[PDB]
Structure formats: structure tokens, C-alpha cells
Design a binder for these strands. Structure first.
Ligand code: ATP
Length: 529
RNA sequence: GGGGUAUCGCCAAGCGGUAAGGCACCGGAUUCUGAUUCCGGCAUUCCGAGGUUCGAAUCCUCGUACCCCAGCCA
């Protein structure tokens, strides 16, 4: 339970409400991100918990920043997380004629006027954070005059910025938001829903409260920056004929260590091609997380974990990463692949190669078993062999034995070096009556596989607070490798996390994999210690 | 000037009766993944100073710190 639910409980009990109706309202100007997921889980979660409704409403009030691509991707991610909205998808643009009708009521009551101060001037008259503002010389036009000027606006008679509609509140109010907040501005831009029907568009504050009222939203939940704004919310609803008055409650937004959430910024990474696109696996976007191999259930857990408070905060990746590991550890069928490979032959081995039965899950027999080809000329990961080591090192030293995964206890004997002091191959003896551990892959039966080792995108924890977040990108956010994996991975499906034993949970990258050359994104590493 | 917030390294319960939980972390026991699983340890102390009370993280003063607002963006 959190503060928002205690409020809802009181509301139900006191008989203030009988049903709860929330909404998630993203603007379609970018893909959704892990931050949005916190709001989604909150809004849609309360609905199903209290057997209530939650609308998906696209706040599409600014046509020059939104695109249809986003509305489709947004609907996509919402479902993927496992949530369904109430009834049909809604749009603020759905209320354009209603909004305009309400602007007129405001005008008719003298609570709004068409101002003509330029954009620079409007800023000047607004005062500062310590100095009150001042009434525009156009502030006292007659209702009749305002009706005329507004229709001129509506009818495209004014250039952009040459006139706008404003609420007539208080230029000296300590709330900067109540100093005659603009209600309509001219934009001769094709809207993705209403095409060119409109050339004057409503501002967020005017649109949002009226839309919540019309939809019968019982609790408008959004982030902390809107606490001041709440005053305008109520002011609008108090001066127009509407029969309900939704209440807004604010909770703090999610900040994740090492990542930027600002869609402006995420947009820069994409536009400047510093990442593949919105769903690149290093992005904090829901679709990127998906491609990265996270699971809708792991994200819901994350939300469940971070809580909901008024407290500003920054979660460490350790918490996110914890969630996906827990999920995958339980449901991921284990398999084997070698990322950095150095050849290892067993001379002692006689035969064209046998077959070893390995479990799909070392702790869950229920998940079945499989037939993995063993051999003499195998593949091993470089860092597993040590020509020289100490008691700690529990892998393959040039003097002792090491158990192969689910196979034979081999024994290191004779190395062979590459001219440049490197190791070309390892020769070891095997003990036919054997069946630390190390993973392997029969050279003869090995499947060529690309591996994409992903790390955090930024090299500082709050790249946001940097003078130039771009200059603080991690150059090792993605490190590609060519390795080998057992042939069963021949049947991996896009997004189906496997646990490459002793490395990390990996998943087939849709975007890149092909027939011969599959591509595996490393979702998250294993607890290395 | 206004609106907000202050509990462990990072989250977070608490709502006058004596500091939950989770992530990280340190042990130790199993383990053919240095994984998983188990065991145990991690706030006499709740931004600071005063005060009320039998008892205060919780009430009341008085400070201090941080966040948000001056888009015809949301
Ligand atoms: N980081 C966040 N943490 C929690 N909730 C968020 C976060 N960012 C946005 N939201 C919520 O998502 C809802 C939709 O956000 P919307 O896409 O309209 O704008 P925004 O993401 O705040 O701004 P921007 O488009 O500049 O990123 C908002 O009502 C807000 O409460």
C-alpha cells in the first residue's frame, strides 16, 4: 500500500466514490520508457485491483512534436506489459470541439481574452519568481471583442504567435502558473488525428482537466512537477459547466542510475545515431528492455518494488537487474556457448564423438533434458585456463584437472603457443570414468554465433546532470563477439531467454539474427563474485 | 516569491507505546554454473536544536538541505 491507495480507500469508505477511474496519458512524442512503466503499473494496477476502469488517452495537444508512429508503439508496449485499457483508446484531440466550446464559455464570462503581446513580450510581463507580473494592455477587451478575435484565430486570420487566448486570473499570484496562463496558441501544422481541421491548439493545462472530467476520471495521478499546476486544474474546472471534478494526486518520478529518461535526450541519442533506434538494447525504453530480453513480468516486479512516494529518488541498476535475474533464473532453460574461444583437444579421446545428456534446468528436472554432442577437439573460454594460478582460481590450470559441464574430468598437460606468446591450443587427458567446472562446445558440432555484450550506456550515474550527457557516453556500452554455442540453440526464438551457463542470460536478437548467423543479446550477467 | 520532501549505501514500511521489508554488502553450510538454494549480520536510532509526554521518527517551536515553477512544451 502507498499514499495514493490510502486516499482511494478513504474515498471508497467515506462514500465519496463508488468506482475508481484512472487513466494513463502519454503524449505521443516518443517511445515509452521504464519511467512510464511506473505510471502504467500504478494507473492500470489500481483499476484492476479495485475492479475499476483505466483509460489509455493520448494527450495529443502539440502537433509539431507528435507522430503516428508513437501512438502505435505506445499501444504496443502497454499491452506487452500485460495491461488493457477500458473501452476504446482516447485522444485529447477527441475533445477539440468540446474544448473550443468551453473556451467560449470562459470568454462569455469574461474569464479569458485574446491577447496580442508577442512571445517575447508575454514573457516580459509575466514577472519573475520574486517579482509579480503585469496586465497586458489587451487584457480588458470586451466579451464581444474577444469572441470576434477568437474566431479570427480559429479561422486562421492570425499568424503564428501573433495572438493567443489567455485565462484572466491573477498576474501577481505567487503561482507562476496562474499569471494568465495561455489556453490556445496558433499552429498551422497538420495534426496526426485531425489533419488540418484545426490551426489553433489547446494547451496542456486547459486540455487535461476537462478531458478527465468528461471521462469521469476519479483520481488524476501524475508526477511531482504538476503540484503547482494543480491550482490551474481546479481553477479551470471551477469556472465552466462540467458536472464532476476529478482530483489530482502526485507521486515522485523514477530516476534510474546511469540512464537518461528525458525523451528530448533519448531522442537525441536516436537522431544523432548514437544508438540503433528507440528499441536499441541499451535504451531505457520498454521496447528496448524487451529486445534486451527483459520480461513484462520482471518490470511489473520492479514497479512493485520501487514503491510510490513523494520522495525524490534514484534507483540503482542493481535493483532492476535483480528482478530480471530472479525471473530468468527460474524460467530460463540453461544451454552452453563460449564467448572467447581457445581450442582444447583431448588426445586420450578415441572416437568420432559421443553424446552427453544435459538437463535443460539443473534445479528443475521437470523442464526436461537434451542430447549434447561430446567430443575430443572441443572449444573452451579463454579465461577458464590458467598456465599459472593460485588456490582461489578453481578452473583449468596447467597442472590439475577440471570437470567439463556434464561430461568428463579432463586434466591439463601440454599447451601450445601462438608466436605472440598467446595460446593456440590446449592438450589435456580425459578420464573415461568421469560422469571446478568449466563450460565447453564440441568444435565439430559448434554453431557460429554472434554475441552482443551490453553494458550501461553512460559512464556516470547521473548523465542527466552533465553539461553534455553525450560526452559522457560509455564507449563499452556494446562489445560484439564471435563465439560458439551448442547446436540446439539453432532453434532459439526471438525473445526467449536462455541462461548460457556461467556467463549470463542471453536472448536471440530479432533485428539482427539470421539463418546461419544468429545474434544473442546479453540480457544481464550472472552474480560474479 | 510560491509549491514540495527529509527513516541504513540505494529504495521503503511507520500515523504516540518503544525502527518492517527489499536491492547491495559481509560472513558461514550445501552445489558438476565462483549461479541458485540455506544460515546468520547489517538504524538504541529516524536532517539539527529546543519543548510537551509516563513513553516522540511520530505532537509543537526554531533552523538547515535538496527538488519543482518565469514554453504560445507536457
Ligand atoms: N520518469 C517518470 N517516472 C514516473 N512517471 C513518469 C515519468 N515520466 C513520465 N511519467 C508519467 O507518465 C505520464 C505520461 O508522460 P508524458 O509522456 O506525457 O510526458 P513526460 O514523459 O513527463 O515528458 P517527456 O515527453 O519530456 O519525457 C505522465 O502523466 C507522468 O506522470
Amino acid at each position: 500500500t502507498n499514499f495514493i491507495r490510502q486516499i482511494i480507500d478513504e474515498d471508497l469508505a467515506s462514500g465519496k466514490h463508488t468506482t475508481v477511474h484512472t487513466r494513463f496519458p502519454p503524449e505521443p512524442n516518443g517511445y515509452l520508457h521504464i519511467g512510464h512503466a511506473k505510471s502504467i503499473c500504478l494507473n492500470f494496477g489500481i483499476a484492476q485491483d479495485y475492479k475499476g476502469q483505466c483509460n489509455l488517452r493520448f494527450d495529443d495537444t502539440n502537433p509539431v512534436k507528435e507522430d503516428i508512429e508513437y501512438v502505435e508503439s505506445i499501444k504496443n508496449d502497454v499491452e506487452w506489459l500485460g495491461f488493457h485499457w477500458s473501452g476504446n483508446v482516447r485522444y485529447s484531440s477527441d475533445y477539440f470541439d468540446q474544448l473550443h466550446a468551453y473556451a467560449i464559455e470562459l470568454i462569455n464570462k469574461g474569464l479569458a481574452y485574446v491577447d496580442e503581446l508577442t512571445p517575447e513580450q508575454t514573457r516580459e510581463y509575466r514577472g519573475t519568481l520574486t517579482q509579480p507580473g503585469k496586465n497586458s494592455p489587451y487584457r480588458d477587451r470586451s466579451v464581444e471583442e474577444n469572441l470576434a478575435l477568437f474566431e479570427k484565430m480559429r479561422a486562421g486570420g492570425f499568424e503564428e504567435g501573433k495572438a493567443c487566448l489567455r485565462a484572466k486570473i491573477d498576474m501577481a499570484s505567487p503561482f507562476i502558473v496562474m499569471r494568465d496562463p495561455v489556453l490556445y496558441r496558433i499552429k498551422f501544422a497538420e495534426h496526426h488525428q485531425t489533419g488540418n481541421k484545426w490551426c489553433i491548439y489547446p494547451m496542456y493545462d486547459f486540455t487535461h482537466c476537462i478531458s478527465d472530467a468528461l471521462e469521469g476520471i476519479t483520481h488524476s495521478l501524475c508526477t511531482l512537477e504538476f503540484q503547482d499546476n494543480r491550482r490551474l486544474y481546479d481553477w479551470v474546472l471551477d469556472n465552466i459547466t462540467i458536472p464532476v471534478h476529478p482530483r489530482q494526486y502526485e507521486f515522485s518520478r523514477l530516476n534510474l542510475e546511469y540512464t537518461v529518461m528525458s525523451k528530448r535526450k533519448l531522442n537525441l541519442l536516436v537522431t544523432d545515431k548514437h544508438v540503433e533506434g528507440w528499441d536499441d538494447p541499451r535504451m531505457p525504453t520498454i521496447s528496448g528492455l524487451r529486445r534486451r530480453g527483459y520480461t513484462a513480468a520482471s518490470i511489473r516486479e520492479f514497479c512493485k518494488r520501487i514503491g510510490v512516494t513523494k520522495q525524490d529518488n534514484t534507483i540503482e541498476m542493481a535493483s532492476l537487474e535483480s528482478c530480471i535475474r530472479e525471473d530468468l533464473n527460474e524460467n530460463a532453460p540453461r544451454a552452453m556457448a563460449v564467448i572467447d574461444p581457445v581450442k582444447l583437444v583431448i588426445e586420450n579421446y578415441q572416437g568420432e564423438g559421443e553424446m552427453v545428456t544435459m538437463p535443460n534446468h539443473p534445479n528443475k528436472p521437470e523442464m526436461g533434458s537434451r542430447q549434447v554432442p561430446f567430443s575430443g577437439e572441443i572449444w573452451i573460454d579463454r579465461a577458464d585456463f590458467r598456465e599459472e594460478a593460485n588456490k582461489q582460481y578453481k578452473r583449468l590450470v596447467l597442472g590439475k584437472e577440471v570437470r567439463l559441464r556434464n561430461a568428463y574430468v579432463i586434466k591439463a598437460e601440454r599447451v601450445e603457443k601462438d608466436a605472440e606468446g598467446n595460446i593456440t591450443t590446449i592438450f589435456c587427458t580425459y578420464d573415461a570414468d568421469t560422469l571446478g567446472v568449466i563450460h565447453w562446445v564440441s568444435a565439430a558440432h559448434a554453431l557460429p554465433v554472434e554475441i552482443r555484450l551490453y553494458d550501461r550506456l553512460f559512464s556516470v550515474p547521473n548523465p542527466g546532470a552533465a553539461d553534455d550527457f553525450l560526452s559522457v557516453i560509455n564507449p563499452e556500452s556494446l562489445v560484439i563477439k564471435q563465439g560458439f554455442a551448442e547446436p540446439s540453440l539453432k532453434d532459439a526464438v526471438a525473445g526467449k531467454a536462455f541462461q548460457f551457463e556461467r556467463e549470463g542470460y542471453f536472448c536471440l536478437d530479432s533485428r539482427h539474427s539470421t539463418a546461419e548467423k544468429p545474434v544473442f543479446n546479453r540480457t544481464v550477467g550472472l552474480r560474479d563474485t
